[PDB]
Amino acid sequence: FNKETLALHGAYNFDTQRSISVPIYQNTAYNFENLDQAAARFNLQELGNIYSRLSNPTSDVLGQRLANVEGGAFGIPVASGMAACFYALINLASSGDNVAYSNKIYGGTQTLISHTLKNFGIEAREFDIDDLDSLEKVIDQNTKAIFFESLSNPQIAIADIEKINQIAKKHKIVSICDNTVATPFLLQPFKHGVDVIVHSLSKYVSGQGTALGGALIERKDLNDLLKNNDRYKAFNTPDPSYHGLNLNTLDLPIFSIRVIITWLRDLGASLAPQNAWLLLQGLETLAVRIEKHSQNAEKVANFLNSHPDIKGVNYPTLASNAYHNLFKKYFDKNFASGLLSFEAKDYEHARRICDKTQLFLLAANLGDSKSLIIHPASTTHSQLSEEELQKAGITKATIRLSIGLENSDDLIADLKQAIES
Amino acid sequence: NFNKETLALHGAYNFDTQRSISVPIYQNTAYNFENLDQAAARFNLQELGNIYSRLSNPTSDVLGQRLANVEGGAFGIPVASGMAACFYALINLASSGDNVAYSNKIYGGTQTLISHTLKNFGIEAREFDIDDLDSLEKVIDQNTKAIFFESLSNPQIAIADIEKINQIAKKHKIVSICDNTVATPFLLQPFKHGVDVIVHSLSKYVSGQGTALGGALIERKDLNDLLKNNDRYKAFNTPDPSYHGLNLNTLDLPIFSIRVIITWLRDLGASLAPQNAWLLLQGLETLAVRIEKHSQNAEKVANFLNSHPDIKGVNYPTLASNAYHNLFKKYFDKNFASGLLSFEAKDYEHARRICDKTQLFLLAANLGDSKSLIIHPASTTHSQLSEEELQKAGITKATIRLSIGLENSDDLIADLKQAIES
Amino acid sequence: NFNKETLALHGAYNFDTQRSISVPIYQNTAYNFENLDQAAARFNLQELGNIYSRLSNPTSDVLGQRLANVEGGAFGIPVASGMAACFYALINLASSGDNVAYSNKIYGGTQTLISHTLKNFGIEAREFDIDDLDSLEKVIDQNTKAIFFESLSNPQIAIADIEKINQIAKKHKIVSICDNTVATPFLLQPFKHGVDVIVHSLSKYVSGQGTALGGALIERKDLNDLLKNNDRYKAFNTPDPSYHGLNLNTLDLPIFSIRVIITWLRDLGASLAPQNAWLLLQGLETLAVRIEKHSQNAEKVANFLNSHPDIKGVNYPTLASNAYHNLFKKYFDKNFASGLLSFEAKDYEHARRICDKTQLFLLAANLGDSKSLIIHPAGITKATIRLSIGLENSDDLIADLKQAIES
Amino acid sequence: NFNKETLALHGAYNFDTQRSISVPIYQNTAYNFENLDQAAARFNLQELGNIYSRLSNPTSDVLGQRLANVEGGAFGIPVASGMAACFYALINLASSGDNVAYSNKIYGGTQTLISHTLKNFGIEAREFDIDDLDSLEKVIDQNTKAIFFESLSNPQIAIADIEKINQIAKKHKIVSICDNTVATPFLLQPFKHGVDVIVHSLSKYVSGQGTALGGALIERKDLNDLLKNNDRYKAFNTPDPSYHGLNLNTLDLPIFSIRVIITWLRDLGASLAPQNAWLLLQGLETLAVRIEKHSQNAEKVANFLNSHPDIKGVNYPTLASNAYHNLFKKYFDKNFASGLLSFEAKDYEHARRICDKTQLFLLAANLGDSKSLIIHPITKATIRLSIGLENSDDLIADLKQAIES
C-alpha cells in the first residue's frame, strides 16, 4: 500500500471490542496472566506489555505506523522531539565519545548537543552541511553519530543526504536525520541511506499545536551496522544491567530495544497515551494537510519575494534559492513544507510586522494549523552567539513564518498590511 | 493558613476568565505572546511566563505548586515520570566526574539508573546502608553532589532515620534528595526534617488509580542558601554559555527548579503531558482520604498475614516487632504506614502458587492503584539486581510484595487466604 | 459474593487482549463487524453487541453494569446527564395522554421538566406530598405510569418513606422511580425497599470533582415481572412497527433497559461521551471513601451551624431535632447522611453577605464537588442557604463559614 | 471579512489569561460566580454567561459559533449527537397536536425518529417526496411547524432543490430545517438558499475520524423575523410559566437558539461533553482540506465502479447520467460531491461476498471516517460506501478484488 494508506491502516488488528479507532490506554500497568509470563517479560525472553513507562499499546500503534510511513523497521515514541534527539544520541555515544552535528539545525537541538551533552562527557563537533569535507575532518574512531536535518529550521537548508551517507557508510557511523519539517510525506531519508530518523511529532504530525511528542525510527537491517562493529561496544558486550545479556545475540531491532530497556526504562521520557492517540489522529491526516501547508507557503513565498519592502526570502521552491537544486533532487512531490523565513528592511521593521499581524500568531512553534510568526535572533536562536547566527544565516531583520491551513488570500492580506505599516 | 487536605483542593489557581471550578486542560503546546518585547523578555528570563509546553504548561503548573504546598516546600516541577524526576534531580546536581551517594534500599529502577545507567554520563554511584549511617560518611568526598534515599522503601518498607541523614548532609553542605512516593506528603513531610529536595513518582499514590504516569521534583524553602556560594555546586555559581553568561547565583528565584526548567526540560524534554497533569491534579485532591483507607486495609492484611501459620515473616511498620517500628512512630504523625507491604511465603514454589491463585490481588507491576496488586520481586522488579544485592536489600526467593488497594478488607483477606492455603 | 466497595473496583470488565488494568477509553463511534451476518444479526436484536456509540460503548458499558452491581440491581444505562436520565426514565413509561405522579420535594430542574416541559409531549404531571402519602393515592388513575421521588431531596434534605411509597406503587402495579443521587448507592439502597427504577445524576457524587456531566438509569432484578402482561404498559406488550412487529414481552432480557437503548438513545441521542464515562468510572471507584468524608464533614458543619447564635435553623438528618431524623435512622445503615445541607441566616441581607464573604465555599451552582460550594436557592425562604460540603479539612471549613457568618 | 477555511481556524475565541493558541478543554460542570447579583442575573436571562455545563460550556461555545460562522448563520448550538440535534430542532418548533413535514429520502434513524418515535409525544409526521414538491403543498396545514430534509441524502445521495422548498416554506411562513451533514458547510451553504435552520451530525465529517459523537443546530441570521409575531409559533410569543411569564418575542437575541438552551438542554439534557466538543473543533479546523480528498477519492471510485462489468449501477452526483447531476451543478460551487456513494452489485449474494472480501473498506455502520467503510443497507443488491482518505489506487484495488472474486 501507499503512504497515505499506511497512515490509516496497520499495526492495529482490533481488540475484542473491534473499535475502528485505536483505544486510548490511559493506563500504567498490565495484568500478567501468571508469574512465568511476567518474569519471562522482565528477561526479554517474551515480548509484551509490562509497564507504560516502557511501552503502551496506543503508542505502539503510533510507533509502527510512523515506521511504516517512513519505510523503516521500528519506531519508538517518546515525550518530545528533544527527548527523541537526546535518546538517539546517547543510544550511540557515551562519556568520552563525540558526535558530529550540522551547523544548521533547530536551536534547542544545537544547545543540547553543543552545551548540555558536555555534562555527560559527550563532545560535540560542528560541521557545515554546505561543505562536507568539513565533516570528514571532524571524524575519528570515537565519533558515534552524524546528526543533521533534512530541511533545516529556520534557514530551510536542504542537506545533500547521499553525500552524507557516503561518508557515514565509509566510516561505519550511524547517521541520524531529523525529518520533522519535511515530514515522511515529502521526503524519505531512508531511501537515501539514513540509519536513524528522528521527528518532533509535536510539529506537523500533530498539525494543530496540541500534543507534544517525539519519535525515533530505525531503518531496516540496522543491526548489520551495529552488530560486530567496534565503534559500538554497547551493542556487542555483555550488559550488567541485564545479567550479561549481549544485544548482538538478539534477532530484534537492537537500537530500538536499547531505547526501551535502558533509556525509557531508566531516564523515563515516556509519551503519555492521550498525546500518543492525538498524534495517531494527526498522522492519519498529515498527507492532505502537508500539501495545503505547502501550497500556501509557496504563494506566500512568491508574494514576499516580489514585495518592495522585503529584502530576501528563504524558501526552496524559489528558483534563485541556493537549495533549489537539492530540493528538486530529493522532493518527489514538488512540495516544500510550511516553514519559510524572510528579511525585513531592518530590526525595527521586523518588530513592527510581528506586532501588526492578526492571522499570523506571534508564538514559538511550527506546523500548527494556525499560521505563526516569530523573530529568531531574540527568541528561538536567542541562545546562539552573534557569530553562530551568521554561520546558520540569521540576522536582526530575519522573520520566520510557519504557514498554516488558512486561506492564502487572507494570509497574504494579513502580511501585506503588517509589512506596509 | 490552611491544612494539607485543604491545600490539595485550593491554591495555585485563580480561575481564568471563564471561572471554571475545575482546572482547565491546556491540551496545547504554544502561546500567543502579546508583543515581541514580551516574547524576547521571556526567552531571556527577564519576565516569567508561558513560552512552550515542553518547558511549562498552566495545567501542570497548578500541580507543581500544589504538590509543593502540601509538602511545605517552595516550588515543584512535574515531569513525565518518577524516573525522569529521579534522573533530573541527580543531574541537576552532579555532572561527569562527580559522584552521588545512594541508599542500598530503594526502588529497583532507581537503583539501576544510579548504579549503572548514570556511568554512561561519567557519574559515579556510591552505595550506603541506611541502617548504618557511618557507611555514608565513608563514601563522601568533595565530589559527592547528592545523598539519595527513600522515606519508606520499596519493597522492604525500610524507614530512613531522616534527621541523622540530614545532620551528615548539612555538615558537608551536600544536597539531600528524598523519594517520598510511598509515604506520600500526607503521612510524612521530609522537609520538616531538613530534606532539601523531594522526588515523587506521581504515577503511584497521587494518581491512585494506575492511570497517569508522572513525576515531580520539589524543592524546600531557602534552598538557594545551600546552592549559592557553595564550591560544591559550580553549575549554580558560574556564567553559563547556554544563557549568554547568566550566573544563577544572581537570581532571586528557586534556582534549583529554574535550572530544571531552562536546562533539563528544555533540552532533554521529559515533559509531562497536560492530560496526565490534570488527572494527577484530580488524584491529588483525594489522596488524603484514599491513603487512609489504603493504610487501614494494609494494617488488617498485615495482622492477618502475621498470624497465619503458612506465612514466615511480614514486613510492615505498624507491626510492633518490626525493625522500623520505632522510626515509624517517630516520623509518622497520623499512625498510618501506607499501602505497601511484603511477606515471606514458605518457599519459592509457594510464592508462585500464591501469585497464580489470587483473584482480587492482580498480578502486575505497579503500586498505589485503587485495585490491589501482587508481584514476586526477585524474578521481576528487582530481577536486574545481583544475587547478593538482593540480600543487602533484604529480598528472597520466597518474598512477595503486595500493594494494598481500596477494596473491602474482608474480601482482600479472603482472597489471600485461599491463595496462601492452596 | 463481594461487598459494595469491592464491586465498584472489580467486575463487568475482563481485560481485553492488552490486559490493561484500567478500562480503556474507547474514543470511538463505530465498530468493525466481523462479517455481514453478525452485523445484520445485531441490527435485529438477535445477537447483542457493539454497533454504534450512540447506542452503546464498551467504556460506558462497564460503568452501567458496575453502577447496577453497587445498587444491587440488574442492568444500568449511562446517558449524557442526570436530566436526560430522569427524562428517559419517564418517557420510557409514559407517552402522550398519560400522567406521572411526582414528589413536591425534588430538584428544581426535574420539577420544571416534569411539571412544564413534559406538557409539550402531552404528558400530564400530578404533584404529591412525600410527607402525606394519602395525597399520592388521590392523584392516581389507570393512566398514571410512574411515581417519581428522591431518596434524600435537593435542597430540603427531605427523606422519603420508601416502604410506604412502594406499597402504594405495588398495589396499583405502577413503576416507581427513585432519584438516589444525593444519598449514593453507598448510603442507601432503594432496591432493597421495592423500588423498580433508580436514576442518578452521576455528575454530582459519582464524579465527585465537578468534572464530568453524566446520568444513569438502573433497573431492579425481575422488573419484567411488572412490565410484561401489564395493561398499564402497552409499549412493552404490543408489536412495535419501528422494529418490524417485535413485541418486547417476548424477550428474555431487561426490557426496560432494552427500550432505553433501541428507542430513546437510538432516536433521541442523549449519549454519554467515552471520556466522561471513563472519568465517572474512576469516580465510582473512590466514592465509598469519599462519601464518608463528605458525610463526616457535613455533620460537623451542621453541628457548628446548629449552635451558632447568628443561625436560625439547620436542615440536616443527623440532627436529632430534624423532622427526617427517624426516617434517617430507619433507612441509612451506615450513619452517614451525605454532604448536602441547608440553613437559615438571620435574613436575606445576611444570607447575601455570607455568600459574598466565603473563601473556601465557592459560590456556584452544583453539588457533590470535592471543593465545598455555596448558593442562595416551596420549603425555602429568602434567608435560606444551601451548602455542598466538600473534602476539605473541617476546621478550615468551619472557620471560613464562621468569619462569613459573623461579618 | 475572511473565507470559510479561515473561519474554521480563527474566531469565537479570545485567548484567556494563559493565551493558549489551542482552545482549552473545560472538563468542568460548574462555574464560580463572582457575586450573588451576577449569579441571579444569569438565572434570569438578564446577563448572558456561564452557569452549568448542561446548558453551555466555553469549549463547546467556540464550536457553536465557528460552525455558525462557516455556514454563514447567526448562532450555533452543539448537542450530544446528530439525532439529538434533529430531535431538538423539531420539538423546538412542534408540540403535541402539531405535525411536521419530512423528506422521504433521509437517514434511517431520522426517519424512525420522525415517523415513529415522535408519535409518543403527540407529534404527527407527514412524508413528502423531494422529487415531486407538489406533494409537499399537499400535506401542509396551519398545524405544520417544520419542513425537514437533507441537502445530500443518506444513502441515496439525493439532492434537494432547496430554492423550491424555500419558496413553499416562505409562502406558508414555516420554518425549514436542512440536515447538511454529508455535503458539509464547505461544499454547500443552505442558508444562501433561504434555509432557516441547519442541523449537522458532527459525528460524521466534522469529526472526520470516527472518534467523537456530536451534533449541532444552527440558525440563520434574522430568524426572529419569522418566529416573532407568527401565529404558527405560539411558544415564541406567549408568556412562559417555566420562566416567570417571560415572553421570548420580547428578546433581542436568537430566540430559537435561546429556547434550545433554557428549555431543551436544560430539561432534556442531551449535552455535548467537553472532550467531544474539543475534538470536533479540531476536526472543524481541517475539514476543508479533508472533504476535498474525500470528494476526489469518491469520484475516482465512482468512475471505476461505473465502468466495471460486474457492477449494475452507481449512485454519485458527479456522474453525468445521474438524476441529480443538474441539481449538483446548480448548488455545488466547488465541484466536489463529498464521500458517500452507493452502487448495485449483480445480486444479493454478490453484495454479500463484496462486504466479506474488502480489506481496506471496513464493514461497519458509520460515514465520514478517514478510514473507508462499507455496508449493505434501495435494493437487495445495494452497497453503500463511505470513501476515506486512503490512496485511491489502493481503494480501487481493494474493491476490484472484492468485486471480482
mmCIF file of C-alpha atoms in Angstrom, chain A residues 87-241:
data_model
loop_
_atom_site.group_PDB
_atom_site.id
_atom_site.type_symbol
_atom_site.label_atom_id
_atom_site.label_comp_id
_atom_site.label_asym_id
_atom_site.label_seq_id
_atom_site.Cartn_x
_atom_site.Cartn_y
_atom_site.Cartn_z
ATOM 1 C CA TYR A 87 17.774 9.384 23.201
ATOM 2 C CA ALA A 88 19.100 8.869 19.697
ATOM 3 C CA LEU A 89 22.469 10.382 20.526
ATOM 4 C CA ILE A 90 23.024 8.734 23.936
ATOM 5 C CA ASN A 91 21.958 5.372 22.491
ATOM 6 C CA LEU A 92 25.066 5.718 20.321
ATOM 7 C CA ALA A 93 27.525 7.836 22.333
ATOM 8 C CA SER A 94 28.658 7.700 25.940
ATOM 9 C CA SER A 95 31.213 9.600 28.025
ATOM 10 C CA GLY A 96 34.482 10.116 26.120
ATOM 11 C CA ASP A 97 32.861 9.869 22.690
ATOM 12 C CA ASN A 98 31.962 12.605 20.243
ATOM 13 C CA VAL A 99 29.171 13.276 17.798
ATOM 14 C CA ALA A 100 29.204 15.278 14.582
ATOM 15 C CA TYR A 101 26.406 17.743 14.043
ATOM 16 C CA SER A 102 25.205 20.141 11.386
ATOM 17 C CA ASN A 103 25.743 23.853 11.903
ATOM 18 C CA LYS A 104 22.203 24.439 10.532
ATOM 19 C CA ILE A 105 19.706 22.950 12.969
ATOM 20 C CA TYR A 106 16.986 23.685 15.494
ATOM 21 C CA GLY A 107 18.302 25.995 18.239
ATOM 22 C CA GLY A 108 17.219 23.689 21.023
ATOM 23 C CA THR A 109 18.951 20.706 19.424
ATOM 24 C CA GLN A 110 22.035 22.871 18.976
ATOM 25 C CA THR A 111 22.107 23.751 22.669
ATOM 26 C CA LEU A 112 21.514 20.092 23.606
ATOM 27 C CA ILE A 113 24.377 18.902 21.501
ATOM 28 C CA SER A 114 26.983 21.684 21.896
ATOM 29 C CA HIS A 115 26.401 22.510 25.589
ATOM 30 C CA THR A 116 24.181 20.142 27.535
ATOM 31 C CA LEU A 117 25.789 16.876 26.418
ATOM 32 C CA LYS A 118 29.172 18.078 27.793
ATOM 33 C CA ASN A 119 27.778 17.424 31.264
ATOM 34 C CA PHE A 120 27.705 13.784 30.313
ATOM 35 C CA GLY A 121 31.214 13.774 28.835
ATOM 36 C CA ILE A 122 29.970 13.781 25.265
ATOM 37 C CA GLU A 123 31.901 16.029 22.909
ATOM 38 C CA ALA A 124 30.196 17.815 20.054
ATOM 39 C CA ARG A 125 31.895 18.653 16.724
ATOM 40 C CA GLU A 126 30.130 21.049 14.349
ATOM 41 C CA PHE A 127 30.319 20.633 10.546
ATOM 42 C CA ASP A 128 28.967 22.615 7.598
ATOM 43 C CA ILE A 129 26.286 20.794 5.555
ATOM 44 C CA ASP A 130 27.211 23.060 2.650
ATOM 45 C CA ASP A 131 30.897 21.889 2.676
ATOM 46 C CA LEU A 132 31.081 18.190 3.509
ATOM 47 C CA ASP A 133 34.858 17.984 3.557
ATOM 48 C CA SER A 134 34.336 19.698 6.954
ATOM 49 C CA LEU A 135 32.585 16.509 8.090
ATOM 50 C CA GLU A 136 35.443 14.180 7.160
ATOM 51 C CA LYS A 137 37.754 16.498 9.099
ATOM 52 C CA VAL A 138 35.993 16.160 12.475
ATOM 53 C CA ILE A 139 35.585 12.381 12.282
ATOM 54 C CA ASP A 140 37.708 9.978 14.373
ATOM 55 C CA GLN A 141 37.176 6.437 15.817
ATOM 56 C CA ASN A 142 35.274 7.961 18.763
ATOM 57 C CA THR A 143 32.674 9.693 16.548
ATOM 58 C CA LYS A 144 29.441 7.752 17.152
ATOM 59 C CA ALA A 145 26.876 9.760 15.211
ATOM 60 C CA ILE A 146 26.367 12.219 12.356
ATOM 61 C CA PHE A 147 23.377 14.438 13.048
ATOM 62 C CA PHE A 148 21.570 16.743 10.636
ATOM 63 C CA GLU A 149 18.169 17.953 9.488
ATOM 64 C CA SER A 150 16.665 17.121 6.113
ATOM 65 C CA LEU A 151 15.112 20.610 5.812
ATOM 66 C CA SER A 152 16.569 22.924 8.469
ATOM 67 C CA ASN A 153 14.902 25.169 10.967
ATOM 68 C CA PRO A 154 14.847 28.208 10.363
ATOM 69 C CA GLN A 155 17.151 28.515 7.357
ATOM 70 C CA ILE A 156 15.222 25.963 5.335
ATOM 71 C CA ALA A 157 18.600 24.492 4.371
ATOM 72 C CA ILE A 158 18.499 21.190 2.489
ATOM 73 C CA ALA A 159 21.102 18.547 3.204
ATOM 74 C CA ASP A 160 22.646 16.549 0.355
ATOM 75 C CA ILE A 161 21.772 13.287 2.020
ATOM 76 C CA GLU A 162 23.521 10.928 -0.480
ATOM 77 C CA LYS A 163 26.835 12.598 0.197
ATOM 78 C CA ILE A 164 26.382 12.456 3.963
ATOM 79 C CA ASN A 165 25.517 8.805 3.586
ATOM 80 C CA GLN A 166 28.693 8.059 1.589
ATOM 81 C CA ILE A 167 30.903 9.460 4.253
ATOM 82 C CA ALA A 168 28.891 7.816 7.025
ATOM 83 C CA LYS A 169 28.906 4.403 5.398
ATOM 84 C CA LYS A 170 32.553 4.585 4.706
ATOM 85 C CA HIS A 171 33.462 5.067 8.379
ATOM 86 C CA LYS A 172 30.667 2.706 9.590
ATOM 87 C CA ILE A 173 28.993 5.513 11.534
ATOM 88 C CA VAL A 174 25.294 5.727 12.312
ATOM 89 C CA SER A 175 23.608 8.664 10.570
ATOM 90 C CA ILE A 176 20.708 10.479 12.260
ATOM 91 C CA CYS A 177 18.287 12.616 10.227
ATOM 92 C CA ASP A 178 15.711 14.924 11.863
ATOM 93 C CA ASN A 179 12.940 14.855 9.235
ATOM 94 C CA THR A 180 10.471 16.944 11.227
ATOM 95 C CA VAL A 181 9.840 19.760 8.787
ATOM 96 C CA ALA A 182 9.751 17.800 5.510
ATOM 97 C CA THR A 183 7.625 15.026 7.090
ATOM 98 C CA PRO A 184 7.704 11.476 5.800
ATOM 99 C CA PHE A 185 5.286 12.523 3.031
ATOM 100 C CA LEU A 186 7.605 14.918 1.307
ATOM 101 C CA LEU A 187 10.899 13.199 1.913
ATOM 102 C CA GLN A 188 12.019 9.677 2.848
ATOM 103 C CA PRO A 189 15.539 9.817 4.279
ATOM 104 C CA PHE A 190 15.716 6.029 4.495
ATOM 105 C CA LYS A 191 15.640 5.835 0.699
ATOM 106 C CA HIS A 192 18.967 7.628 0.756
ATOM 107 C CA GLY A 193 20.877 5.546 3.265
ATOM 108 C CA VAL A 194 19.914 7.175 6.552
ATOM 109 C CA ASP A 195 20.147 4.827 9.545
ATOM 110 C CA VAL A 196 18.005 6.613 12.109
ATOM 111 C CA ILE A 197 15.252 9.193 11.718
ATOM 112 C CA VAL A 198 14.043 11.489 14.499
ATOM 113 C CA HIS A 199 10.849 13.519 14.452
ATOM 114 C CA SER A 200 9.367 16.164 16.608
ATOM 115 C CA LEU A 201 5.786 14.850 16.333
ATOM 116 C CA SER A 202 4.798 17.994 18.188
ATOM 117 C CA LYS A 203 5.003 19.956 14.915
ATOM 118 C CA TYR A 204 3.396 18.627 11.647
ATOM 119 C CA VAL A 205 2.262 15.149 12.798
ATOM 120 C CA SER A 206 0.078 16.870 15.439
ATOM 121 C CA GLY A 207 -0.543 19.677 12.999
ATOM 122 C CA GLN A 208 -2.601 21.597 15.496
ATOM 123 C CA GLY A 209 -0.335 22.656 18.334
ATOM 124 C CA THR A 210 -1.998 20.267 20.756
ATOM 125 C CA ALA A 211 0.273 17.340 21.522
ATOM 126 C CA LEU A 212 3.911 17.482 22.453
ATOM 127 C CA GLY A 213 5.768 14.350 21.339
ATOM 128 C CA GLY A 214 8.725 12.769 19.566
ATOM 129 C CA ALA A 215 9.804 9.581 17.792
ATOM 130 C CA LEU A 216 12.960 7.616 16.992
ATOM 131 C CA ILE A 217 12.720 5.442 13.914
ATOM 132 C CA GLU A 218 15.236 2.900 12.703
ATOM 133 C CA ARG A 219 15.767 1.598 9.179
ATOM 134 C CA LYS A 220 15.500 -1.995 8.105
ATOM 135 C CA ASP A 221 18.634 -4.062 8.764
ATOM 136 C CA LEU A 222 20.275 -1.504 11.067
ATOM 137 C CA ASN A 223 21.612 -4.476 13.101
ATOM 138 C CA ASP A 224 24.043 -5.097 10.164
ATOM 139 C CA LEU A 225 25.752 -1.795 11.020
ATOM 140 C CA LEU A 226 25.626 -2.135 14.830
ATOM 141 C CA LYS A 227 26.421 -5.806 15.315
ATOM 142 C CA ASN A 228 30.144 -6.703 15.183
ATOM 143 C CA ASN A 229 31.148 -3.081 14.811
ATOM 144 C CA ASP A 230 33.998 -1.999 17.068
ATOM 145 C CA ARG A 231 32.664 1.524 17.044
ATOM 146 C CA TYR A 232 29.583 0.437 19.045
ATOM 147 C CA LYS A 233 30.515 -1.713 22.037
ATOM 148 C CA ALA A 234 27.300 -1.111 23.956
ATOM 149 C CA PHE A 235 25.633 -3.311 21.308
ATOM 150 C CA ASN A 236 28.333 -6.034 21.433
ATOM 151 C CA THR A 237 29.189 -6.581 25.082
ATOM 152 C CA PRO A 238 27.514 -8.353 27.993
ATOM 153 C CA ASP A 239 25.476 -5.775 29.887
ATOM 154 C CA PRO A 240 25.455 -5.952 33.704
ATOM 155 C CA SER A 241 22.109 -4.126 33.929
#
